[PDB]
Amino acid sequence: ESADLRALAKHLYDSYIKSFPLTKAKARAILTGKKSPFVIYDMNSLMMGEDKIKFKHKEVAIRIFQGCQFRSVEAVQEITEYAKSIPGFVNLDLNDQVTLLKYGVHEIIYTMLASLMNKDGVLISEGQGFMTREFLKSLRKPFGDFMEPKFEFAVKFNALELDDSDLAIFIAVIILSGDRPGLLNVKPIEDIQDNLLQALELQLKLNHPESSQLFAKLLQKMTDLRQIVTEHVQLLQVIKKTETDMLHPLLQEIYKDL
Amino acid sequence: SADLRALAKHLYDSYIKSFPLTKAKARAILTGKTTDKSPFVIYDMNSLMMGEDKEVAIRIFQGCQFRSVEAVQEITEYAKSIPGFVNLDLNDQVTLLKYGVHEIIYTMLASLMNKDGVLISEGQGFMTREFLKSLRKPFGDFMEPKFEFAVKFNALELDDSDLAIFIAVIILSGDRPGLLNVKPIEDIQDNLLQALELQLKLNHPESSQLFAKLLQKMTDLRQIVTEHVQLLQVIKKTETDMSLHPLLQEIYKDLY
Ligand SMILES: O=C(O)c1c(Sc2ccccc2)c2cc(Cl)ccc2n1Cc1ccc(Cl)cc1
Ligand SMILES: O=C(O)c1c(Sc2ccccc2)c2cc(Cl)ccc2n1Cc1ccc(Cl)cc1
């Protein structure tokens, strides 16, 4: 049903624009130099970055990694608003909505982080800043190897040259996964995903006509994505049992993990 | 189009050549069809001893490792039949096998499995899921993810002709860590994906987005492998005296 697959795509894109203040288009305009980000390439610029840039968020490697978590928690609420705009989502059993978000959000976080990344570093504070990949590697060794696999993933993901229109449908596909553990009613979830997959496939065909098997290549990117998430959780589980620099009891409660 | 049906059939024939127990034969065994013989059932320590013909948990885990070496050989033989594979850089041939072999082992183990157990010794035996759960920690947990995957994967109702192409798609992954020449591998996988999409459309005409759903299962496959390497490390930390096959040591060296 081609025309309402197109309407679904347009609806998702419009909701994506509504929910996500920094889009890939804007992020790319900055990364390609096509305003300008304050650059964090060393400890000096880091310290100067912290004073100039708001950082609405107590020693460097920790300051950075905690800041990342604070920002991810913010992203969870953006992803949640977006999910609720996916037709059918808010009428799912509430338990199932929670389950799909519980497992979906991490995956979406790394997908959207790729939009902010290139081989040389990552956009931070809504494109107001740019932290270099070298500066991150230079860090403190449980922390120098924490973003590296994300840069690896991002470089291969970004080679697909997806745009916001593509990503809006791909993110929806991720959320409506009938394979999440503990789901009560898989039927409407798979029904919704079926239509999203059809919309994604058409979108990719129209948006990237010269791009053979792009649908398949993208779906298989989900394998590396889940691996990133899995290995990131066990890095958090290592970081916790070992890191003393992680009210604050009230803060801990908000940012514990999402 | 081109020539995707010939490619599909070549892969199917090479798969039949390389793997001695097909899903069709496995299913005929599991469901009591008269084309095939019924299996001996291992369901407790008693029947295990009579099925075999010093601690059982280690001996079973070790038995599985050993059949996995045979599986690695069968898969390598199959990979050579994949058009373009033998033309790739030698180091890349090694990398693709290194990372692909276990995802293939788990795909193919699903063929041997139902919710209640797994075919063993080329389908001559059947070992119950409940018996495996009864093994000593940390050996009572090691097959569970594989059964959980098998049940979900088997719901796709793929046959051997579908699986032949899927396994080839798995091996020809341009995203494997440490590949030197990614382009020629993606060129090959492009053709395999085209063949797979067409095969599922013709073989499963009433099954919507089966192609997408199958590809999505590669995500589960990777997580089985990831979680298996974790378990091996727990085994490493907590057991002694266990030998390991050079093929396996080699695959597992620097694996995730
Ligand atoms: O607050 C930020 O914008 C930020 C941060 S917070 C921060 C950045 C630099 C120095 C100290 C804190 C961040 C940290 C890392 Cl290691 C990687 C990416 C980071 N970002 C960008 C980011 C964007 C989106 C999401 Cl979900 C997570 C992080
Ligand atoms: O030799 C076998 O056929 C076998 C074995 S070996 C074995 C089985 C029962 C008692 C003693 C050894 C095996 C063990 C587990 Cl835990 C699970 C599946 C197993 N199988 C079936 C099997 C099929 C294929 C692959 Cl690559 C690995 C194992």
mmCIF file of C-alpha atoms and ligand atoms in Angstrom, chain A residues 22 40 46 50 55 57 60-76 78-79 108-110 112-113 116 122-127 131 135-136 139 146-147 151, ligand 1:
data_model
loop_
_atom_site.group_PDB
_atom_site.id
_atom_site.type_symbol
_atom_site.label_atom_id
_atom_site.label_comp_id
_atom_site.label_asym_id
_atom_site.label_seq_id
_atom_site.Cartn_x
_atom_site.Cartn_y
_atom_site.Cartn_z
ATOM 1 C CA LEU A 22 19.766 17.912 17.185
ATOM 2 C CA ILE A 40 37.996 19.860 23.337
ATOM 3 C CA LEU A 46 38.376 20.646 28.571
ATOM 4 C CA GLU A 50 33.456 23.486 31.199
ATOM 5 C CA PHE A 55 27.101 21.738 31.087
ATOM 6 C CA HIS A 57 25.728 18.652 34.879
ATOM 7 C CA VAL A 60 38.246 14.492 34.502
ATOM 8 C CA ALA A 61 37.696 10.870 33.288
ATOM 9 C CA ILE A 62 34.841 10.586 35.803
ATOM 10 C CA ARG A 63 33.474 14.083 35.061
ATOM 11 C CA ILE A 64 33.271 13.135 31.350
ATOM 12 C CA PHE A 65 31.750 9.671 31.766
ATOM 13 C CA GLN A 66 29.148 10.893 34.307
ATOM 14 C CA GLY A 67 28.302 13.773 31.954
ATOM 15 C CA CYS A 68 27.705 11.233 29.207
ATOM 16 C CA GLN A 69 25.282 9.335 31.475
ATOM 17 C CA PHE A 70 23.436 12.514 32.511
ATOM 18 C CA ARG A 71 22.950 13.298 28.811
ATOM 19 C CA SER A 72 21.826 9.743 27.957
ATOM 20 C CA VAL A 73 19.142 9.991 30.656
ATOM 21 C CA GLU A 74 17.903 13.133 28.888
ATOM 22 C CA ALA A 75 17.865 11.240 25.582
ATOM 23 C CA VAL A 76 15.679 8.474 27.097
ATOM 24 C CA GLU A 78 13.265 12.254 23.894
ATOM 25 C CA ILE A 79 13.136 8.636 22.640
ATOM 26 C CA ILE A 108 18.641 4.006 19.801
ATOM 27 C CA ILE A 109 21.133 6.002 21.873
ATOM 28 C CA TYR A 110 24.095 4.495 19.948
ATOM 29 C CA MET A 112 21.768 8.557 17.207
ATOM 30 C CA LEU A 113 25.201 9.037 18.716
ATOM 31 C CA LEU A 116 27.087 13.116 16.122
ATOM 32 C CA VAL A 122 32.002 13.567 18.769
ATOM 33 C CA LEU A 123 29.653 16.548 18.934
ATOM 34 C CA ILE A 124 28.737 17.445 22.513
ATOM 35 C CA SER A 125 26.318 19.880 24.274
ATOM 36 C CA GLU A 126 23.868 20.057 21.316
ATOM 37 C CA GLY A 127 26.564 20.723 18.714
ATOM 38 C CA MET A 131 35.452 16.405 21.789
ATOM 39 C CA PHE A 135 41.434 13.199 23.722
ATOM 40 C CA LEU A 136 39.077 10.366 24.725
ATOM 41 C CA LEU A 139 42.063 9.110 29.119
ATOM 42 C CA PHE A 146 35.248 3.045 26.522
ATOM 43 C CA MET A 147 34.236 5.169 23.495
ATOM 44 C CA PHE A 151 33.658 5.203 17.085
HETATM 45 O O1 LIG C 1 26.502 16.194 27.252
HETATM 46 C C1 LIG C 1 26.850 15.884 26.095
HETATM 47 O O2 LIG C 1 26.415 16.432 25.067
HETATM 48 C C2 LIG C 1 27.859 14.762 25.924
HETATM 49 C C3 LIG C 1 28.795 14.382 26.865
HETATM 50 S S1 LIG C 1 28.985 15.096 28.455
HETATM 51 C C4 LIG C 1 30.663 15.673 28.510
HETATM 52 C C5 LIG C 1 31.392 15.926 27.346
HETATM 53 C C6 LIG C 1 32.707 16.382 27.445
HETATM 54 C C7 LIG C 1 33.300 16.597 28.693
HETATM 55 C C8 LIG C 1 32.574 16.352 29.856
HETATM 56 C C9 LIG C 1 31.259 15.890 29.755
HETATM 57 C C10 LIG C 1 29.512 13.326 26.335
HETATM 58 C C11 LIG C 1 30.557 12.549 26.817
HETATM 59 C C12 LIG C 1 31.081 11.543 26.009
HETATM 60 CL CL1 LIG C 1 32.373 10.561 26.588
HETATM 61 C C13 LIG C 1 30.566 11.311 24.735
HETATM 62 C C14 LIG C 1 29.520 12.095 24.259
HETATM 63 C C15 LIG C 1 28.991 13.104 25.059
HETATM 64 N N1 LIG C 1 28.010 13.992 24.852
HETATM 65 C C16 LIG C 1 27.190 14.064 23.623
HETATM 66 C C17 LIG C 1 26.002 13.087 23.772
HETATM 67 C C18 LIG C 1 24.892 13.211 22.938
HETATM 68 C C19 LIG C 1 23.816 12.329 23.064
HETATM 69 C C20 LIG C 1 23.841 11.320 24.026
HETATM 70 CL CL2 LIG C 1 22.501 10.226 24.176
HETATM 71 C C21 LIG C 1 24.946 11.185 24.859
HETATM 72 C C22 LIG C 1 26.020 12.068 24.734
#
